């Protein structure tokens, strides 16, 4: 009520920017926290006072940050201000322009409804979907994509080019590590084109792995790229001249290699998700284990070097568990299987070698046995839906990426929407959906096109 | 013939949609190797290939007139030795032949610790798509 | 409302078959997706049409494909409507013939029902059970 007698008075600025540069759009941006903290007013009172002033000068208005309300709504993580935004179906024919989502037909309970891409699409500066995908800030980003202009672009961006790109990108380090791995096995004329070929193509993964780091857990694989490269470049730096140590530095790229195509099972929805449950699980849970592991290791190991404390006297086949190096290497073959346990005659006391061993045993095994637990405990209702999460979000920063990527013409090409007469002297970009609705009827007033069918 | 009699047995496995019981289980062993196992195959496969010409790169010094000193020498043989290894078949153990006896010992760790956390993640995926999937859709 | 009144006209013709082949009972199994998109109209629509022509005609017709609406409702994956078919108790005792589900004898909560099984059972070709069985779409 208040706010209708502030905006019927004469005096009042509805357009009054602040100190900050907010206008009163903006601060709706700012205090829209949820639905279930708040009811949802802040988007009632946002249709409210643009309807009550008829313009774009509100939702056009840049704050000394630099962003319109639109943008602020994905910069800060407001959702239900932004699915209100993004979707406005206006019945007033008079304030008709100020709507984004319009049906240009409907013949029944089908219905295609024309979506804006102003400031969506990548065309402008710091749009919408760069926003949404490049800030790490929120983790709400999936409830952000779910909407349906940015959704359906990012599933026409990937059905046009991406795909091919991740394909063909694919394909190159496919056969970049098929030749580092002949190389390997291997190790003129061949031997020489593919170093020259491997050296030519490392380079530019290193100046990609740079310029990205630079420009900066879903980074972790830039810099295992970044390693990778280095150390193939060391190595064939090392072969020229007379050293030994090239070939250490070379594998340990390959092997590495390998597990970097990790990275490329991201394209498979399946495998996707399959990749990220691996990375999350490394992260989080196997960790715990192998500290605790490790621990044991360090301390019943130079327990049970101690024990053998006595020489090998003239053999050492009979001093077992000597060195401590020796010690936690057969106590790792334990764990697995392949030592060989037996009562010790080099030591002192024998019965305490073996009761240390066997409780060794023992707490590896419940300290399996929990991880396990922890593991089952805290997947459920998780790696089913955050992996999801996740691969997907991945999924749209490379998309981003390969579309940064291209040059001008290209993008020209592929600019997805198509040009339309929205109402009378407005032309503008937008993406046209169809659904089919079949609980809601009602009879089609406000449609553009009087002949409902594709042309 | 064998190729035939031991496919056999595992086309017996048919003849268990009968019981509802050994029904279920069959589908869902199917099922699973379908859909699940191959994800740890691959992976597995590629791991393989990728560690085995490493180790084999290691052993490019001769076995110098003992073959028995030259473990990890063919590709196969390496393979082999891994595949054992992830089992508990093998015999875990420094090199001599080696140059670089350390690194191998690396790479072979970190060889059964991936194998480790891949047969863990392919259990994780499994117990998540089975619930309410394997119990009805079986 | 508007069903009524072009029923009630006499110039219409409900046997009507369109260019596919399909009446009106066709074009209502194609048009069944289910119940949480529809709220379950189609099947009521599927009962007023039939009870307001009481026949076999148009059950008994078959589109250019080769198919009547019952093996319609079980090539495509309706199934609401294929429950509505295959078990009717009509309390009309005029229109007691149009259908499928007969009660011959109830003494008390028991109640023996009697079924039919013209065109589903595997004695006729394309049956509506070998449609539901041989197919994977």
Redesign the interface.
């Given at each position: 009520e208040i706010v209708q007698l502030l905006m019927e008075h004469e005096q009042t600025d509805i357009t009054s920017r602040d100190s900050r540069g907010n206008n009163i759009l903006h601060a709706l941006v700012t205090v829209a926290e949820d639905f279930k903290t708040q009811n949802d007013f802040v988007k009632r009172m946002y249709d409210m006072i643009l309807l009550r002033s008829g313009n774009w000068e509100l939702e056009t208005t840049r704050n000394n940050d630099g962003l319109t309300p639109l943008q602020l709504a994905a910069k800060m993580g407001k959702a239900e201000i932004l699915k209100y935004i993004l979707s406005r179906e206006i019945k007033e024919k008079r304030l008709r322009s100020l709507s984004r989502k319009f049906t240009d037909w409907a013949y029944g309970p089908v219905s295609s409804s024309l979506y804006d891409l102003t400031n969506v699409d990548t065309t402008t500066d710091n749009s919408v979907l760069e926003i949404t995908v490049y800030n790490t800030n929120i983790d709400n980003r999936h409830e952000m994509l779910t909407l349906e202009p940015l959704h359906t672009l990012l599933h026409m961006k990937w059905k046009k080019f991406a795909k091919h790109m991740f394909f063909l990108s694919f394909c190159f380090y496919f056969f970049y590590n098929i030749t580092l791995?002949l190389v390997?096995?291997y190790?003129g004329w061949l031997q020489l084109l593919g170093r020259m070929f491997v050296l030519i193509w490392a380079m530019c993964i290193s100046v990609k792995e740079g310029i990205a780091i630079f420009l900066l857990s879903d980074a972790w694989f830039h810099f295992v790229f970044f390693i990778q490269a280095v150390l193939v470049i060391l190595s064939v730096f090392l072969y020229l001249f007379a050293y030994?140590e090239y070939?250490?530095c070379?594998?340990?790229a390959?092997?590495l290699?390998?597990?970097n195509?990790?990275y490329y099972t991201r394209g498979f929805q399946?495998?996707g998700?399959?990749s990220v449950?691996?990375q999350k699980?490394?992260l989080h849970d196997?960790l715990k284990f192998?500290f605790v592991y490790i621990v044991f290791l360090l301390g019943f190991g130079v327990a049970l070097a101690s024990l053998i404390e006595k020489c090998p006297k003239d053999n050492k086949d009979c001093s077992s568990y000597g060195s401590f190096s020796d010690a936690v290497?057969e106590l790792?073959?334990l764990t697995?299987?392949?030592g060989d346990l037996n009562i010790q005659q080099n030591s002192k006391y024998p019965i305490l070698f073996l009761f240390l061993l066997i409780t060794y045993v023992i707490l590896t095994f419940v300290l399996l046995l929990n991880m396990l637990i922890a593991?089952?405990g805290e997947?459920?209702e998780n790696?089913?839906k955050e992996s999801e999460r996740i691969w997907r979000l991945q999924r749209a920063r490379t998309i981003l990426e390969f579309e940064k990527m291209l040059p001008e013409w290209l993008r020209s090409r592929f600019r997805m929407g198509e040009l339309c007469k929205v109402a009378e002297d407005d032309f503008r970009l937008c993406l046209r959906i169809n659904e089919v609705k079949?609980?809601e009827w009602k009879t089609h007033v406000s449609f553009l096109n009087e002949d409902p069918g594709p042309v």
């Amino acid at each position: 009520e208040i706010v209708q007698l502030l905006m019927e008075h004469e005096q009042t600025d509805i357009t009054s920017r602040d100190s900050r540069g907010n206008n009163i759009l903006h601060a709706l941006v700012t205090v829209a926290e949820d639905f279930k903290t708040q009811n949802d007013f802040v988007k009632r009172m946002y249709d409210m006072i643009l309807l009550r002033s008829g313009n774009w000068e509100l939702e056009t208005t840049r704050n000394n940050d630099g962003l319109t309300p639109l943008q602020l709504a994905a910069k800060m993580g407001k959702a239900e201000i932004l699915k209100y935004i993004l979707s406005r179906e206006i019945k007033e024919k008079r304030l008709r322009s100020l709507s984004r989502k319009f049906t240009d037909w409907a013949y029944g309970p089908v219905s295609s409804s024309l979506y804006d891409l102003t400031n969506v699409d990548t065309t402008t500066d710091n749009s919408v979907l760069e926003i949404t995908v490049y800030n790490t800030n929120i983790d709400n980003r999936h409830e952000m994509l779910t909407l349906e202009p940015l959704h359906t672009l990012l599933h026409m961006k990937w059905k046009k080019f991406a795909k091919h790109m991740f394909f063909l990108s694919f394909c190159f380090y496919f056969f970049y590590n098929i030749t580092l791995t002949l190389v390997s096995y291997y190790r003129g004329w061949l031997q020489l084109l593919g170093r020259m070929f491997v050296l030519i193509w490392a380079m530019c993964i290193s100046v990609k792995e740079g310029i990205a780091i630079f420009l900066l857990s879903d980074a972790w694989f830039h810099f295992v790229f970044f390693i990778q490269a280095v150390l193939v470049i060391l190595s064939v730096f090392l072969y020229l001249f007379a050293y030994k140590e090239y070939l250490a530095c070379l594998v340990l790229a390959m092997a590495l290699g390998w597990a970097n195509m990790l990275y490329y099972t991201r394209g498979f929805q399946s495998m996707g998700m399959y990749s990220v449950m691996i990375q999350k699980v490394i992260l989080h849970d196997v960790l715990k284990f192998l500290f605790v592991y490790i621990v044991f290791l360090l301390g019943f190991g130079v327990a049970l070097a101690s024990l053998i404390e006595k020489c090998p006297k003239d053999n050492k086949d009979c001093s077992s568990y000597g060195s401590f190096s020796d010690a936690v290497l057969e106590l790792f073959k334990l764990t697995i299987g392949l030592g060989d346990l037996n009562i010790q005659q080099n030591s002192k006391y024998p019965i305490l070698f073996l009761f240390l061993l066997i409780t060794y045993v023992i707490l590896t095994f419940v300290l399996l046995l929990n991880m396990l637990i922890a593991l089952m405990g805290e997947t459920v209702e998780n790696v089913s839906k955050e992996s999801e999460r996740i691969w997907r979000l991945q999924r749209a920063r490379t998309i981003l990426e390969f579309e940064k990527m291209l040059p001008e013409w290209l993008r020209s090409r592929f600019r997805m929407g198509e040009l339309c007469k929205v109402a009378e002297d407005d032309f503008r970009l937008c993406l046209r959906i169809n659904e089919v609705k079949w609980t809601e009827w009602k009879t089609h007033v406000s449609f553009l096109n009087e002949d409902p069918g594709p042309v």
